[PDB]
Amino acid sequence: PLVVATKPSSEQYILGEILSLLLEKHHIPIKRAFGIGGGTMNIHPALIRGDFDLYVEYTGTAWVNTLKNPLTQKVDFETIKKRYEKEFNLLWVGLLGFNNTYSLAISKEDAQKYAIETFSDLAFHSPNFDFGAEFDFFEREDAFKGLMKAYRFHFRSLHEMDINLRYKSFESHKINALDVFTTDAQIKELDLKVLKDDKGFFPNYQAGIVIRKETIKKYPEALKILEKLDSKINDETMQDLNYQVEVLKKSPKIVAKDFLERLGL
Numbered sequence: 040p041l042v043v044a045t046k047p048s049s050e051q052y053i054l055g056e057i058l059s060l061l062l063e064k065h066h067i068p069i070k071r072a073f074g075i076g077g078g079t080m081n082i083h084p085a086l087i088r089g090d091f092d093l094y095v096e097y098t099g100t101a102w103v104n105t106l107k108n109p110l111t112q113k114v115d116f117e118t119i120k121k122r123y124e125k126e127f128n129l130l131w132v133g134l135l136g137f138n139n140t141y142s143l144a145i146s147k148e149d150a151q152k153y154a155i156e157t158f159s160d161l162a163f164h165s166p167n168f169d170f171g172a173e174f175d176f177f178e179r180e181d182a183f184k185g186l187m188k189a190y191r192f193h194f195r196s197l198h199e200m201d202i203n204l205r206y207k208s209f210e211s212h213k214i215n216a217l218d219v220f221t222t223d224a225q226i227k228e229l230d231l232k233v234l235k236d237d238k239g240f241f242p243n244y245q246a247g248i249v250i251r252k253e254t255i256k257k258y259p260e261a262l263k264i265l266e267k268l269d270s271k272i273n274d275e276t277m278q279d280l281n282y283q284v285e286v287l288k289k290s291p292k293i294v295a296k297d298f299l300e301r302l303g304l
């Protein structure tokens with residue numbers, strides 16, 4: 040059977056269940072390998088070697104982490120696809136239609152207190168903030184290392200935690216500034232102030248299905264099926280599905296089932 044992997048986020052579970060249910064509807068055998076610790080850093084090699092068959096990746100993450108390209112070049116999907124096929128024998132099916140990129144968030148009270156609107160504002164007052172993020176945020180060149188080269192933050196403290204504990208650390212006041220994702224249900228849930236990336240540091244993170252070319256060779260129907268999801272999930276749809284899971288307490292499975300029904304797939 041085809042093994043569908045995801046990163047350990049609610050959004051990735053929704054996408055994984057959408058892929059798994061869609062393939063199961065076409066009688067393709069599926070095994071779920073959800074919430075792989077470390078995300079891409081462990082998904083990418085397992086995909087290359089064949090432990091996994093497909094997952095949903097973001098363009099800018101492949102651009103920096105796997106393709107070894109500099110952030111001085113604009114992320115280019117056609118380049119990503121060509122190099123993935125030539126060097127990795129991997130196929131980007133397409134783009135789902137939405138872009139979940141990095142941002143920075145603080146409490147709205149702190150934003151008003153310190154006149155913080157932009158990333159540079161946060162850096163300017165950073166000695167008054169305890170910043171927290173997931174482990175990989177301090178390792179990827181497109182995350183904290185680049186933010187430090189571009190903005191030179193001097194946070195009072197740094198806290199590394201499991202990716203699913205960040206907002207909880209913010210709620211407990213262990214940290215009072217953190218990295219967020221633009222489609223996170225918790226941005227609205229906690230009424231956070233998301234800062235403006237005034238130097239345009241973070242690239243494009245459009246979500247798309249990455250699948251082994253061997254799997255498409257064995258199952259052309261899987262490619263034909265998965266292309267029906269192309270451009271069917273814009274930013275608002277991803278944000279609402281995540282809201283349905285994290286706020287309305289629906290399971291990722293039920294959210295994916297309802298979405299596929301809505302699409303008529």
Ligand SMILES: C[N+](C)(C)[C@@H](Cc1c[nH]c(=S)[nH]1)C(=O)O
Nearest residue numbers: 046077078097100139140175244
């Ligand atoms: C989707 N995203 C915002 C572009 C990040 C999120 C993420 C990074 N690492 C893990 S784990 N999750 C990514 O996958 O690079």
